[PDB]
Design a protein around this motif. Structure first.
Motif, PDB file in Angstrom:
ATOM      1  N   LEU A 110      66.439  19.970  37.448  1.00 38.71           N
ATOM      2  CA  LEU A 110      67.154  19.978  38.749  1.00 38.71           C
ATOM      3  C   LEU A 110      67.360  18.526  39.132  1.00 38.71           C
ATOM      4  CD1 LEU A 110      64.772  22.611  40.389  1.00 38.71           C
ATOM      5  CD2 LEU A 110      67.043  23.097  39.356  1.00 38.71           C
TER       6      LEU A 110
ATOM      7  N   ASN B 151      68.493  23.344  45.882  1.00 38.09           N
ATOM      8  CA  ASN B 151      68.250  23.586  44.474  1.00 38.09           C
ATOM      9  C   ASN B 151      68.388  25.051  44.079  1.00 38.09           C
ATOM     10  OD1 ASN B 151      65.702  24.517  45.362  1.00 38.09           O
ATOM     11  ND2 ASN B 151      64.615  22.623  44.655  1.00 38.09           N
TER      12      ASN B 151
ATOM     13  N   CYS C 240      61.605  19.749  38.362  1.00 41.68           N
ATOM     14  CA  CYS C 240      62.100  18.746  39.310  1.00 41.68           C
ATOM     15  C   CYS C 240      62.103  17.370  38.670  1.00 41.68           C
ATOM     16  CB  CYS C 240      61.173  18.762  40.532  1.00 41.68           C
ATOM     17  SG  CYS C 240      61.416  17.450  41.728  1.00 41.68           S
TER      18      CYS C 240
ATOM     19  N   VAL D   3      53.772  20.392  50.362  1.00 46.74           N
ATOM     20  CA  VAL D   3      54.060  21.201  49.185  1.00 46.74           C
ATOM     21  C   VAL D   3      54.172  22.656  49.684  1.00 46.74           C
ATOM     22  CG1 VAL D   3      52.974  19.792  47.302  1.00 46.74           C
ATOM     23  CG2 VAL D   3      51.518  21.436  48.666  1.00 46.74           C
TER      24      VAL D   3
ATOM     25  N   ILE E  63      54.447  22.888  42.526  1.00 41.27           N
ATOM     26  CA  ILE E  63      54.873  21.567  42.025  1.00 41.27           C
ATOM     27  C   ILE E  63      56.260  21.611  41.374  1.00 41.27           C
ATOM     28  CG2 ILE E  63      52.546  20.592  41.849  1.00 41.27           C
ATOM     29  CD1 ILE E  63      52.831  20.797  38.671  1.00 41.27           C
TER      30      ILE E  63
ATOM     31  N   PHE F  26      66.901  27.927  48.132  1.00 36.27           N
ATOM     32  CA  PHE F  26      65.730  27.372  47.408  1.00 36.27           C
ATOM     33  C   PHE F  26      65.545  28.055  46.053  1.00 36.27           C
ATOM     34  CE2 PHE F  26      63.363  26.151  51.657  1.00 36.27           C
ATOM     35  CZ  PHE F  26      64.190  25.046  51.781  1.00 36.27           C
ATOM     36  N   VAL F  27      65.231  27.256  45.032  1.00 38.50           N
ATOM     37  CA  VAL F  27      65.112  27.785  43.694  1.00 38.50           C
ATOM     38  C   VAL F  27      63.998  28.832  43.569  1.00 38.50           C
ATOM     39  CG1 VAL F  27      63.563  25.878  42.898  1.00 38.50           C
ATOM     40  CG2 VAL F  27      65.028  27.098  41.258  1.00 38.50           C
ATOM     41  N   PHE F  28      62.941  28.721  44.372  1.00 31.19           N
ATOM     42  CA  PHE F  28      61.851  29.703  44.223  1.00 31.19           C
ATOM     43  C   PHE F  28      62.053  31.023  44.957  1.00 31.19           C
ATOM     44  CE2 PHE F  28      60.316  26.266  47.190  1.00 31.19           C
ATOM     45  CZ  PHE F  28      60.661  26.929  48.362  1.00 31.19           C
TER      46      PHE F  28
HETATM   47  C1  UD1 Z   1      62.906  23.768  47.659  1.00 30.40           C
HETATM   48  C2  UD1 Z   1      61.853  23.180  46.731  1.00 30.40           C
HETATM   49  O1  UD1 Z   1      62.046  23.174  45.492  1.00 30.40           O
HETATM   50  N1  UD1 Z   1      60.753  22.688  47.345  1.00 30.40           N
HETATM   51  C3  UD1 Z   1      59.658  22.055  46.536  1.00 30.40           C
HETATM   52  C4  UD1 Z   1      60.135  20.572  46.329  1.00 30.40           C
HETATM   53  O2  UD1 Z   1      60.292  20.129  47.710  1.00 30.40           O
HETATM   54  P1  UD1 Z   1      61.231  18.868  48.164  1.00 30.40           P
HETATM   55  O3  UD1 Z   1      60.994  18.533  49.574  1.00 30.40           O
HETATM   56  O4  UD1 Z   1      61.253  17.805  47.178  1.00 30.40           O
HETATM   57  O5  UD1 Z   1      62.558  19.660  47.982  1.00 30.40           O
HETATM   58  P2  UD1 Z   1      63.954  19.370  47.411  1.00 30.40           P
HETATM   59  O6  UD1 Z   1      64.822  20.585  47.442  1.00 30.40           O
HETATM   60  O7  UD1 Z   1      64.522  18.228  48.133  1.00 30.40           O
HETATM   61  O8  UD1 Z   1      63.867  18.755  45.902  1.00 30.40           O
HETATM   62  C5  UD1 Z   1      63.357  19.367  44.774  1.00 30.40           C
HETATM   63  C6  UD1 Z   1      64.211  19.164  43.453  1.00 30.40           C
HETATM   64  O9  UD1 Z   1      65.441  19.845  43.685  1.00 30.40           O
HETATM   65  C7  UD1 Z   1      66.540  19.002  43.384  1.00 30.40           C
HETATM   66  N2  UD1 Z   1      67.674  19.392  44.206  1.00 30.40           N
HETATM   67  C8  UD1 Z   1      67.521  19.413  45.680  1.00 30.40           C
HETATM   68  C9  UD1 Z   1      68.576  19.796  46.442  1.00 30.40           C
HETATM   69  C10 UD1 Z   1      69.834  20.167  45.740  1.00 30.40           C
HETATM   70  O10 UD1 Z   1      70.799  20.528  46.370  1.00 30.40           O
HETATM   71  N3  UD1 Z   1      69.883  20.113  44.393  1.00 30.40           N
HETATM   72  C11 UD1 Z   1      68.853  19.733  43.594  1.00 30.40           C
HETATM   73  O11 UD1 Z   1      69.027  19.732  42.384  1.00 30.40           O
HETATM   74  C12 UD1 Z   1      66.033  17.558  43.482  1.00 30.40           C
HETATM   75  O12 UD1 Z   1      66.864  16.765  42.619  1.00 30.40           O
HETATM   76  C13 UD1 Z   1      64.565  17.704  42.997  1.00 30.40           C
HETATM   77  O13 UD1 Z   1      64.604  17.713  41.562  1.00 30.40           O
HETATM   78  O14 UD1 Z   1      59.084  19.897  45.592  1.00 30.40           O
HETATM   79  C14 UD1 Z   1      57.691  20.030  46.123  1.00 30.40           C
HETATM   80  C15 UD1 Z   1      56.748  19.317  45.136  1.00 30.40           C
HETATM   81  O15 UD1 Z   1      57.020  17.919  45.159  1.00 30.40           O
HETATM   82  C16 UD1 Z   1      57.299  21.552  46.296  1.00 30.40           C
HETATM   83  O16 UD1 Z   1      55.973  21.667  46.901  1.00 30.40           O
HETATM   84  C17 UD1 Z   1      58.293  22.166  47.235  1.00 30.40           C
HETATM   85  O17 UD1 Z   1      57.991  23.593  47.427  1.00 30.40           O
END
Ligand code: UD1
Ligand code: UD1
Lengths: 490, 485
Positions: A97, A212, A240, A278, A317, A370-372
């Motif tokens: 991602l 994501n 990630c 997290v 994570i 959200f991916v999850f």
């Molecule tokens: C929504 C999600 O996954 N949340 C997790 C993410 O939070 P965090 O606050 O980092 O959430 P984000 O959605 O910003 O980012 C996570 C990942 O998603 C990617 N991304 C984000 C937005 C988008 O439109 N496209 C995309 O590809 C980013 O490049 C990164 O690789 O990491 C934490 C660990 O560090 C976890 O505890 C969180 O539960």
């Protein structure tokens, strides 16, 4: 189809203000805006917004579905073997991602290109590439045949071009171009509280990646699941980009999920500080999910079980395991059921006066999936717990901000890990006179620094294979061990 | 004339007068060093240049603020009662001095950047004032928690000046007692005292275990007995969250009939630089972080936790009778811990150099090395987010335990106190903010909140200030009321 037809479409959707500066725009800027507006689906956008405004207890997972690298150490060898076997049979792919964009680190390029300051100066992208190359090499040695782990990389509108060029320039870090598949996720407009799309500039709509979880419509848009099936893949490791310690295509996590018969798995570390950002894995009404850190109440976060641990301690994570048949069902059936998580934000915009404003108060919302959120649909969900010093040190902030999860913490976590790998394989570190340094440094004067040590993934994936290099020997840090040998820097 | 000259001769330290014929202060210092003793200390310390015998802390001596939450009120009551009876004192270890934070003044004077700008000394003083005030309200009489502060020759003067300037922060001059700890010279590997200047010997404080000889030199124990003190809370100056004179920890030790106690937090990362409390051959010890093997540090118990997880946060409880015994009897048994060092020096030919390789060693005694002599030792475990965020490094260094982490740990804790007391934080439009913010943009910052110890010692007493109310951070709550910056 001309400006007259576009004006009517916009007006019927309550978005005619998007053309308010049309007569003041340069001809080239009108061509640009016209093209952008023409590609948007205003009806769907209005529907998303309506649900977002409308859409505006937890229990731990049962012990039966949770595995632990630490408490189940007796099964690691079997899981690792199953994972390497799958990799050797060309049944494993990874999906990165890398669509996030935001500038919190203070730079203009994507995070995967960031150099956290390791002795080797390798970027996140390169360290990940070398771990994939390492496993292809290890699998070939234990089974004999050559194998492939395709690398799907999801980018967004503001990263596709730059990411592609960076890879081209680096000759794909040693992997084959035909085994790296770039695809872009969708974008969504920022919207004010009243439902109007926000213009960032007189000729530009304020857009941002769709979260994501936008992964699922992006997979459908570029026939990625068909590509996975055609390559004969069964397992996908989704992860990630920002974690310098990520075990890309980890054979232990993959083997564990395969052995349990899972179609979905989440890797976690123990959350110990209630306010750590997290998400936590849990279940509500018997269905598995992650409650994001920004959606949990302090009372819930601080709750403790009888043994003294946080009751909700399975910290997400962002490393998941999905089978290809499960993704196919998500993409063609469940995707519409995933809801948008809404955030109120300060969105830079151009005012009715034509000036660019940085709002002092939140002026709109950002919608994202959200991916999850697909965990709830899995037929068999499992959780796999690992230690954070071995597997999780994220890059979220600049050094000048809150003091954690920054380039400094990231490079130091990788160097402390590799320093431990050397000690565990029988080696030692020494000072300038050759006196032995302790496992934990006394950092008392301004010039004292921790031991700098970096082992290339090609040499060691997770600590194995170093005895011939370091057993019974001593080294002067910074120590680097890579494909060109053992190097003590000065 | 050659009285000292012969003295140095017998000790083989004659080289210290190598730049004499090139003279007052170099004499005043030189005649205050027991050369016979220093050679003895060096030999023994360097001698021959424990992990296998280490045993984890047994459950019978460990209490937990989390697991034994049902007993907190009774412990807290016992400690406050003691404070009200003038039977509690605190002792601050403030003799440390280094160039690590890049400042020329002692750590107590450091301002980590809180909204109030208060220094560590001021925050600690206000926690003392606060408990005197709370004990007076609960029991009816004015009471005193004397504050003994150990300084070194490199901190003594600055410290006194700072306090005088701040009028002792509201405490009374007569109840703050400063005393200096001894010093030790750096020595070459061959046992030769190193001269820093042709006229100055390289010197440094003799470790926080130098506390016991310092207490004897200034008759500190007699002072304590004269005041009728029973319990002494010894603590490190660098922790912004330190619960000075904590009634819960004091009450726990009293109730358990302890003569020695150590407060700890759960160590979860094998390489965290905290000493670990353990038992070796039937007696308690702290194995310092720089003396433990990685194998021992990484060992895990069946429940997944580290086997040696009792992380020392340098917060100890000692009874006055125990300290007396230590000062007058056990002190000589304390050994010196050695560390190699790059010591700036002035070698032959009046050449001033900055060593490129370590050129000598420094010796230190450790404050916790007396645990082994206790008649009844106890361990009390607390949560690190409530009680431990040390200041050890500058922001430009390794990335942890620096001014930034310290200020954020205090503000996060106070932000939590407000929520737990029913208050809420809101954004500029009045929408309520989550407990854990999403920090995504360059300008996003966590909630800034700071509550003066005079208002709340550990989260209590805030209902009338924040219950059912909304605030725009930065939020400061002090003796002057609620302030939104
Ligand atoms: C929504 C999600 O996954 N949340 C997790 C993410 O939070 P965090 O606050 O980092 O959430 P984000 O959605 O910003 O980012 C996570 C990942 O998603 C990617 N991304 C984000 C937005 C988008 O439109 N496209 C995309 O590809 C980013 O490049 C990164 O690789 O990491 C934490 C660990 O560090 C976890 O505890 C969180 O539960
Ligand atoms: C020996 C000791 O206590 N070690 C503890 C200290 O280690 P750490 O190595 O961090 O600390 P130091 O021994 O340098 O200093 C601890 C305290 O002792 C004082 N000081 C130090 C030297 C001296 O000669 N005089 C003096 O008064 C300092 O001012 C400070 O208040 O804190 C850690 C928690 O952060 C604990 O886990 C360590 O076990």
């Amino acid at each position: 189809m001309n400006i007259n037809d576009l004006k009517l479409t916009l007006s019927k959707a309550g978005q005619e203000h998007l053309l308010r500066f049309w007569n003041e725009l340069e001809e080239a800027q009108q061509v640009e805006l016209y093209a952008e507006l023409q590609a948007m689906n205003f009806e769907e956008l209005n529907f998303f917004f309506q649900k977002a405004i409308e859409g505006f207890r937890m229990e731990p997972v049962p012990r039966e579905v949770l595995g632990s690298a630490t408490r189940d150490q007796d099964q690691l060898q079997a899981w690792e073997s199953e994972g390497l076997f799958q990799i050797s049979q060309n049944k494993v792919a990874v999906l990165l991602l890398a669509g996030g964009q935001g500038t919190r680190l203070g730079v203009a390029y994507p995070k995967g290109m960031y150099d956290v300051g390791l002795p080797s100066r390798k970027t996140l992208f390169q360290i990940q590439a070398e771990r994939i190359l390492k496993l292809q090499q290890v699998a070939e040695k234990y089974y004999g045949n050559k194998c492939i782990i395709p690398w799907y990389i999801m980018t967004s509108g503001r990263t596709m071009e730059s990411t592609k060029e960076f890879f081209t320039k680096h000759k794909y870090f040693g992997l084959k171009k035909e085994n790296v598949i770039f695809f872009q996720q969708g974008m969504l407009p920022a919207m004010s509280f009243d439902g109007k799309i926000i213009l960032e500039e007189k000729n530009k709509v304020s857009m941002a990646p769709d979260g994501n979880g936008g992964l699922y419509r992006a997979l459908a848009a570029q026939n990625i699941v068909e590509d996975m099936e055609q390559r004969g893949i069964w397992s996908i490791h989704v992860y990630c980009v920002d974690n310098i310690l990520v075990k890309v295509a980890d054979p232990r996590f993959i083997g564990f999920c395969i052995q349990k018969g899972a179609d979905c798995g989440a890797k976690v570390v123990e959350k110990t500080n209630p306010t750590e950002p997290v998400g936590v894995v849990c279940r509500v009404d018997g269905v598995y999910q992650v409650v994001e850190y920004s959606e949990i109440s302090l009372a819930t976060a601080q709750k403790r079980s009888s043994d003294g641990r946080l009751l909700f301690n399975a910290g997400n994570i962002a490393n998941h395991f999905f089978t290809v048949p499960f993704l196919r069902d998500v993409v063609n059936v469940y995707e519409p059921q995933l809801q948008h998580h809404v955030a109120q934000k300060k969105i830079p915009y151009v005012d009715t006066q034509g000036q660019l404003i940085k709002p002092d108060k939140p002026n709109g919302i950002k919608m994202e999936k959200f991916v999850f959120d697909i965990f709830q649909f899995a037929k068999k969900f499992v959780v796999y717990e690992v230690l954070r010093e071995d597997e999780f040190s994220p890059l979220k902030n600049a050094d000048s901000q809150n003091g954690k999860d920054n380039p400094t913490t990231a490079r130091h976590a990788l160097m402390s890990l590799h320093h431990c790998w050397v000690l565990n394989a029988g080696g030692h570190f020494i000072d300038e006179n050759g006196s032995r340094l302790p496992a934990i440094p006394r950092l008392k004067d301004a010039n004292d620094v921790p031991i700098q040590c970096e082992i290339s993934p090609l040499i060691s994936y997770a600590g194995e294979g170093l005895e011939s290099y370091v057993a019974d020997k001593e080294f002067h840090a910074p120590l680097i061990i890579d494909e060109n040998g053992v190097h003590e820097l000065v």
